[PDB]
Design an enzyme around this catalytic site. Structure first.
Site, short mmCIF file in Angstrom:
data_model
loop_
_atom_site.label_atom_id
_atom_site.label_comp_id
_atom_site.label_asym_id
_atom_site.label_seq_id
_atom_site.Cartn_x
_atom_site.Cartn_y
_atom_site.Cartn_z
N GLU A 43 51.98 2.95 -3.00
CA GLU A 43 52.47 4.34 -2.09
C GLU A 43 51.67 3.54 -0.52
OE1 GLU A 43 50.47 7.57 -3.65
OE2 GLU A 43 51.64 8.13 -3.91
N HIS B 84 44.02 4.78 -6.62
CA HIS B 84 43.17 5.29 -5.57
C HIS B 84 41.48 5.73 -6.21
CE1 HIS B 84 46.96 6.76 -3.56
NE2 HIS B 84 46.73 5.88 -3.16
N1 LIG Z 1 46.80 10.01 -4.30
S1 LIG Z 1 45.60 11.06 -3.41
O1 LIG Z 1 45.79 11.52 -2.06
O2 LIG Z 1 45.10 9.79 -4.15
C1 LIG Z 1 45.01 12.71 -4.71
C2 LIG Z 1 45.73 12.36 -5.52
C3 LIG Z 1 45.39 14.25 -6.62
C4 LIG Z 1 43.97 14.48 -6.75
C5 LIG Z 1 43.72 15.60 -7.11
O3 LIG Z 1 44.18 16.52 -7.68
C6 LIG Z 1 42.35 15.84 -6.98
S2 LIG Z 1 40.35 15.15 -7.44
C7 LIG Z 1 40.92 16.10 -8.99
N2 LIG Z 1 42.11 15.28 -9.85
C8 LIG Z 1 42.17 16.52 -10.88
C9 LIG Z 1 40.93 17.12 -11.57
C10 LIG Z 1 39.69 17.01 -10.64
N3 LIG Z 1 39.64 16.20 -9.05
C11 LIG Z 1 43.31 14.23 -5.11
C12 LIG Z 1 44.00 12.93 -4.21
CL1 LIG Z 1 42.92 12.44 -2.64
ZN LIG Z 2 46.80 9.12 -5.24
#
Ligand SMILES: NS(=O)(=O)c1ccc(C(=O)CSc2ncccn2)cc1Cl
Ligand SMILES: [Zn+2]
Length: 258
Positions: A103, A116
């Site tokens: 990314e 990540h």
């Molecule tokens: N690409 S990234 O920016 O690192 C990123 C991607 C997905 C999510 C989430 O949807 C939440 S963390 C989570 N997800 C699902 C269930 C429980 N915790 C958060 C982030 Cl910071």
């Molecule tokens: Zn991510």
């Protein structure tokens, strides 16, 4: 709903989450001559308990290793951060070719993939969901992967993939020594940004390590055999799941090192 295919992929997200076109979107191009060294940044303070890992699942968008975030056994401190950020989940982004999978891109180098590590500010917020909506709420550690020798910790993840091929499937997964997976140097870049997937919230302090870790080409290819479709739906494979770089828009990218 959103995905990485032609009709639902990154260039269309702006149509259905307008903050896709926000002022603090991620990922970005990291131009090492433009970054500012900042002597106030601290080394990372990293504590990851291997027993914190509990479940691995296929979301349709990546795999996720979920950690028990009930208390503060696994936390990130230091770096650019005020206070303690609790480990929540780990996931990976890749491309269809080893050529171009990460990314963040560094002076035009894409890596084969990008891990990540997502954390939330429990010193200020009561839960991940609340933290996710605030500028200081989340911290993500990004780690590049380059093709090289097979990675024994990643082999634990690849060994589970057959059991979670369909969207929504989960299986138990623990004893994951995330601390030992990180590269030898923890020198990093940092900037304020966003989730790189919908809902694209501008709540993330990004911490991107300069030094990649290695993965074999055969291990990386196993990830592309996850489906973005659920049981019973026409199969489509998650061969690529990375968002392009977004405009810097005047943000300062800082370096922990020079
Ligand atoms: N690409 S990234 O920016 O690192 C990123 C991607 C997905 C999510 C989430 O949807 C939440 S963390 C989570 N997800 C699902 C269930 C429980 N915790 C958060 C982030 Cl910071
Ligand atoms: Zn991510």
């Amino acid at each position: 709903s959103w995905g990485y295919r032609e009709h639902n992929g990154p260039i269309h997200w702006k149509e259905f989450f307008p903050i896709a076109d926000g002022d603090q979107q991620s990922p970005i191009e990291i131009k090492t001559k433009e970054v500012k060294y900042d002597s106030s940044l601290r080394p990372l303070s990293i504590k990851y308990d291997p027993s914190s890992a509990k479940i691995i699942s296929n979301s349709g968008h990546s795999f996720n290793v979920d950690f028990d975030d009930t208390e503060n056994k696994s936390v990130l401190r230091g770096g650019p951060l005020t206070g303690s950020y609790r480990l929540r989940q780990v996931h990976l982004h890749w491309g269809s070719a080893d050529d171009h999978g990460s990314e963040h891109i560094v002076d035009g180098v894409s890596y084969a993939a990008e891990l990540h590590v997502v954390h939330w500010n429990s010193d200020k917020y009561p839960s991940f969901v609340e933290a996710a909506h605030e500028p200081d709420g989340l911290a993500v550690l990004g780690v590049f992967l380059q093709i090289g020798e097979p990675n024994s910790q990643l082999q634990k993840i690849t060994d589970t993939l057959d059991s979670i091929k369909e969207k929504g499937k989960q299986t138990r997964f623990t004893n994951f020594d995330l601390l030992s997976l990180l590269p030898p140097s923890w020198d990093y870049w940092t900037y304020p940004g966003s989730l790189t997937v919908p809902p694209l919230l501008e709540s993330v302090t990004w911490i991107v390590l300069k030094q990649p870790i290695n993965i074999s080409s055969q291990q990386l290819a196993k990830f592309r055999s996850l489906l973005c479709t659920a049981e019973g739906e026409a199969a489509a494979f998650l061969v690529s799941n990375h968002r392009p770089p977004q405009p810097l828009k005047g943000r300062k990218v800082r370096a922990s090192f020079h």
